[PDB]
Amino acid sequence: KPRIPVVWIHGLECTCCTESFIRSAHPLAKDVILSLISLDYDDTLMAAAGTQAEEVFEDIITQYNGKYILAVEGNPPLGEQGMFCISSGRPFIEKLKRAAAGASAIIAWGTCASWGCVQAARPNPTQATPIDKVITDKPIIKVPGCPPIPDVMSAIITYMVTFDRLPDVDRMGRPLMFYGQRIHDKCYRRAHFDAGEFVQSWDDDAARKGYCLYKMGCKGPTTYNACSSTRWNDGVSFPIQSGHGCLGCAENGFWDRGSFYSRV
Amino acid sequence: KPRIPVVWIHGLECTCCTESFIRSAHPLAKDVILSLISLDYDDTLMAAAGTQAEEVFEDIITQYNGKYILAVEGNPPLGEQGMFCISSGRPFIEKLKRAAAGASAIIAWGTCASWGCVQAARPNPTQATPIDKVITDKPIIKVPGCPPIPDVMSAIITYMVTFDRLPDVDRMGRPLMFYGQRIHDKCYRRAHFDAGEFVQSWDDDAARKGYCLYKMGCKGPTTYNACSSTRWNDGVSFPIQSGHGCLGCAENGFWDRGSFYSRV
Amino acid sequence: STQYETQGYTINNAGRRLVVDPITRIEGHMRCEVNINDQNVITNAVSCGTMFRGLEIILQGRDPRDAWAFVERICGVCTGVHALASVYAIEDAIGIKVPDNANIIRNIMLATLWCHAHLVHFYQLAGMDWIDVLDALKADPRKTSELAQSLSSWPKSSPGYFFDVQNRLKKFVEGGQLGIFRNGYWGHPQYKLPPEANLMGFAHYLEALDFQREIVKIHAVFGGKNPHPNWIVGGMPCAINIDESGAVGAVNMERLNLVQSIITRTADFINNVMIPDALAIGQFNKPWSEIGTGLSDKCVLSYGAFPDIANDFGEKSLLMPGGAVINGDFNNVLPVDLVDPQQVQEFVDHAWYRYPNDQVGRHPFDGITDPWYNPGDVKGSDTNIQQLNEQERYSWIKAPRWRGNAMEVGPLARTLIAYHKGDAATVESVDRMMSALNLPLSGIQSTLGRILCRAHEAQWAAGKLQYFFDKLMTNLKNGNLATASTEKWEPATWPTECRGVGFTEAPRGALGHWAAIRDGKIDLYQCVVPTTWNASPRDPKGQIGAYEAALMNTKMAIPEQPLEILRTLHSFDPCLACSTH
Amino acid sequence: STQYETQGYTINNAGRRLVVDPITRIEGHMRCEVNINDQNVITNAVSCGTMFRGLEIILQGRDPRDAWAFVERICGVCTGVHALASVYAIEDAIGIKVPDNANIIRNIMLATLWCHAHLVHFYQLAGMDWIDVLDALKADPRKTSELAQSLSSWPKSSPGYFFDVQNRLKKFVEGGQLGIFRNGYWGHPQYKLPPEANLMGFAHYLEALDFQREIVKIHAVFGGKNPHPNWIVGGMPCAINIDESGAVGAVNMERLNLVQSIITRTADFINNVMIPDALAIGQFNKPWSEIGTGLSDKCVLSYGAFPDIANDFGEKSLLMPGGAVINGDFNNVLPVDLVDPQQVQEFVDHAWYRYPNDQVGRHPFDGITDPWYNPGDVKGSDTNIQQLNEQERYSWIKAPRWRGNAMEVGPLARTLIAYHKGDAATVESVDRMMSALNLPLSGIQSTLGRILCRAHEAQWAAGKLQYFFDKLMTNLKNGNLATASTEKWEPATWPTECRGVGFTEAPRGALGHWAAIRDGKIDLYQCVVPTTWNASPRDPKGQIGAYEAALMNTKMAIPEQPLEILRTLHSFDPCLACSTH
């Protein structure tokens, strides 16, 4: 029984979303790759390089025109005629457009693909631009976070495969299932927020009792993600549980909303 | 080096605390038994039965008089001259008293040993009585819950082995580390409580969004335990996360505080 | 002394008396006494439950919606099954129908418990009756590897692994702190495995001790925690949300993915570790296919379980069949009706309870739990028992009968009922297992057969987990998300007076809860639990229960070392807290 | 075409030009070109970083306390190491000393990363250069089991396991959906493993893909999440509470127990899976001890890492030694100073950046990051590079030099430095490893040697995790719980103008961050990262970097199939996002 073809491309990025994907606990990334999808192109993992890789790319997007899913990590830079990110001697944006043209739908993994992330932070030297400002004629599901949670990535994949449809999304294109609520609306330190019980300086008595991180700059009140519920790395922790406020990493523009240590 | 001798006895009980212990994820119960302690008597797991088991009990409490830790699960009944719970043809309370006399300290596992639990709920047909109302001359660490969290049980054990001392306790003899805060003070649904966002009937829209269970009878506001932070079964869930209010199962008398579905 | 005949046995209490108190590697408190003749053969066996709590009394006056939580604490080893029987009973009384997903999730909870309970029993409770742990120290690691690889595809079989396990055991016992192995029966002549099979089994004991913790993560997803997950009258509390805002607050795709991962791992472990080990025990202990038969060739009982059609408890719905066989007539599987006052009855003439007439049995809707500790003319005294008097009251366990017959329940019972009703998967599995051992079908009616059936059921339940999971996902794909019916949640909606029966097959056998509600409160709540059947004391006719019967006629190599008694008792997975409640 | 001599090489761009773009199984974007002569031997090699983001520019004007979070996103593969270098640099600038537990926890974070990064590189990135996956389909499962069992104690070795792995591969391939295996180099004559070794290796690839997820749970405990954990200037945010109320809100005994479980499993996997597989690769590929030497017999650099005395970055503190060797003189390991303007300098005469004078090198405190895309005459256009022009600017990577010398960094470099400084454990380990392969010491200076050193380092790091964990637990037993110093958290406490250097050894090699603070904000932030060294373009003297040197003089069997180029490049674990930042 054939598996759905997937093409995974990489613009300007740090590769954290790929790393997050391989951290998936259930299903294991191994079983996603072997049993759920056909990951037919991916520079990080594929055997072929160079001309052999370019042949795989061309063959898959032609053979499966209109039927593959495009996963995108990172983003295209518009500066220097696109040559801040070069793919087979040409601007990455050309490869992005070719891959997008044949896709049935696009998954924009991470804050880079969704919004811009760190390379788009002031002063955006490369004119890094999110996927939906370049590709304007295709369904784009945004899965933001730096990176998104591993088991969120894999749940989104299994939803699409099992239900044979894209997830329902909010007005920004984020899946409602994992992005419908704020971190602060499911945070286990909310009792302390409500009581005025705050960490005031690192490793103070409050910190040692797990008090709220709002005065340390937590951006949980304005950030939509699943970190406080689903949690990270097979439910082991999340930023706030280990004592650091949320940075706001799933939100557009989070790098430029003031210091991480300044209050919401 | 020799491992610390432990004698584990069982009164009236359901055996949930033993089952909880073997669910420990870190350290594995296997490694606790092989490497951390010497579990020298335990009716649930030991090879010997009958006269051979009685010889083990005698030999250990004599050879290691003053030096073993006594773990108690369950409780003694005072009714029918103690013969609601019979061990080797005699009241269990006699075995409890003999084991307690040689112990350096006693761990009361679970709400049965700590307070009474279900057999002590009205009308307490057997006159089931918690350990500290019978044994009045030994340190008793209460580890309540029905049962206590697996990795709480193993963390208490590792604390004692590593630091070579009993955990510091509250005024009720419960370890401060895991029983110092209320469920409701570290509950991830607290945002909803504060907003007046409540489940009103099972499987309503509120339930499907993870709203607070206060109106469904959640006893989290008056219950001290680690369920909302440490969570259960290697961090997988806890009662509230899976949609049922806290029953109050770590607190003395929780069965007789009204219906589980009546508000705190 | 006296002698009398019942059920083809000669019960004779002359001769030497042996006492085993405590019975270990069970749940709860049991005492067993036997008499043995000159030939070291058991001629009398006495099963005694040595605990009581009184849940049936404690439940009076409670809200029926709370009952599940109380009765769940009957037992932490079969955790969940009493909650299930409770919600069934209360729903039956009030007239509540649950949504399909709630029924499917409940079936998942039960199958999960079967997998866990059967696995842990096989290794942690019964295993050391069959595996000589100390003899593992004499094994050759390479020959252990070769044996393991001849029996299974399981990956963990290298010579270096078995050497490492053997060295862990060697270090464990080097300081003379033998722990759970101290003063065991090691070297008894009935230990028949070669050293390599002992080491293989001991390795697997440790692997199962580790792995069992994972199985119950399925309970944690749907039920919050294990032990003692949560339930509701009307369905389950674990609301589902796959594709809407706020799925982070519900059973979502990530939670279902975790469940699927556990199912696959559980099936793999059972199929590739437990199943081949059970067969290996069989291969090396074939004489035990003729020991411990007891009632298993006479009278067996199943209520049935796992309704596949939601709210339908009939024969066309239950995936695990129900029925009764009596008089050794396996050609006549009889239907069971739990409301019929002439079918299930409990007697207390030999138990520590009061009835108005102790020469008759009471159906549970007429049940009475009035404790009366009266051991009578014991050797010793009432607080220092040297020998129970089995001619009068000798247990906290009531004596259930079916149409007056003493029955065996549990995995062997169910297997026999399903086989003789013609269940294709049961017939195929049993025929293949008995073929592999070169034993006749009658070899299953035995202590060895109880163990083989338990392993068969663990594999059956692991397969059913996947079936139920897939059914749940099919509903979700069709937009059917409901997990609770609440139109009769409030007490004002209930009948002023009503009664109900909740029944299932727990790991140890047929379970029923009978409840009567009046004026919004529990008026009566009576439980009859599988080990109540099997560990039963005698009735007014002197008929013996399943444990006493299975022990009759057993040869003992060394009277002072009760290995043969332990092997047979442990084969039923006794749960004494269950039995007495 | 031209020819010139440098570093013992003849750089000749006559002959056929081959282009490999993209390089795959790396992090980020790289292009490589070579020329080959009539004997298919490389006579010219050109390393090109094909991405840039500009973190050094973005960091200007940030609060120094926030810098770690921005620079962490230089790379998600070596996640955490840039955060560590950042907090070190800001603390060095301001004059902050952290408590001992914070230092120990930082060391744990770094050792965790080493374990993870080295393991994933070995299997997922480099492994398919050495293992012919499709050839595994021809293996005999029993001979595979025998092979595995001869190399290791690892449990997972049964014939049935290897058959199951093989069958899963067979079903995966049979429909033509080869995924990551499509159009690979399978059957190339440089694949020398027998089929059994290919199946063993492939099984381990899959086991490592699963297992690696567990290692980073240590980062989750102390840092919240992986990828991209959290840190603070002044220590770590993960406050500790072992025995007081509210320990549920902190790093408590349960959290520490989780960490310990992961450490043990990590060491077990590395010692019994990765280490034997690395040695087996060595046994079957000995000629690669003579290929890809490059600069490793000429010039190698380590800054050192893992200060064991908190806040002391000197030789007596660093557990991983620092030093430099030049001119092949391994008898004189030279001290490195990151403030000395004559030591580390970066050149841009062959890179896409503007300096006022491109013939001179700038120390990072004088660094400039002014991007200038100017490729000159490629064959093609500015947006269609057919052939880079290595006589002018050809990369987004700057060219670092040490005292004007081109250096190799990374595991092989570090191993050579430690060996030649006389580190006893390193000397003993290296000597025993080369003895086992029946190779001379010089065999480590090679592409094979890079792989062997990486495996050795994974083992070292796994050992150090336990050492650091034990040091933390000792402090806790002594009542020392502090994790942060906050005396200089507030900007009003800082010097108006200050500068600092943060340095460490990332998995790929020597890492430095140079920061200048003025008026409470970052005035300058310059990074020189390990792959910047290794993947460096040329300098004004024409000197070539580590990658270009390592590729020089290499024979290719089949020019159109760049397996030999991939093998050598992958042996350095290229991280192109790191290199360019």
Ligand code: SF4
């Ligand atoms: S720690 Fe952050 S998300 Fe949690 S309650 Fe406080 S401000 Fe809200």
Ligand code: SF4
């Ligand atoms: S669900 Fe219970 S513990 Fe949580 S906020 Fe509501 S009342 Fe409190």
Ligand code: FCO
């Ligand atoms: N299984 C089980 Fe427990 C018993 N007997 C119940 O019900």
Ligand code: FCO
């Ligand atoms: N390791 C690593 Fe990344 C690179 N190069 C950094 O620093």
Ligand code: SF3
């Ligand atoms: Fe996951 S590539 Fe890493 S930087 Fe923020 S999302 Fe981007």
Ligand code: SF3
């Ligand atoms: Fe854990 S034995 Fe189970 S009933 Fe409540 S604690 Fe008792």
Ligand code: F3S
């Ligand atoms: S920083 Fe990111 S990972 Fe979650 S807790 Fe905040 S959205």
Ligand code: F3S
């Ligand atoms: S019922 Fe018990 S298990 Fe925890 S959530 Fe409440 S204390």
Ligand SMILES: [Cl-]
């Ligand atoms: Cl790409």
Ligand SMILES: [Cl-]
């Ligand atoms: Cl952004």
Ligand SMILES: [Cl-]
């Ligand atoms: Cl006991």
Ligand SMILES: [Cl-]
């Ligand atoms: Cl209580």
Ligand SMILES: [Mg+2]
């Ligand atoms: Mg009853």
Ligand SMILES: [Mg+2]
């Ligand atoms: Mg730089």
Ligand code: NI
């Ligand atoms: Ni039970």
Ligand code: NI
């Ligand atoms: Ni990197």
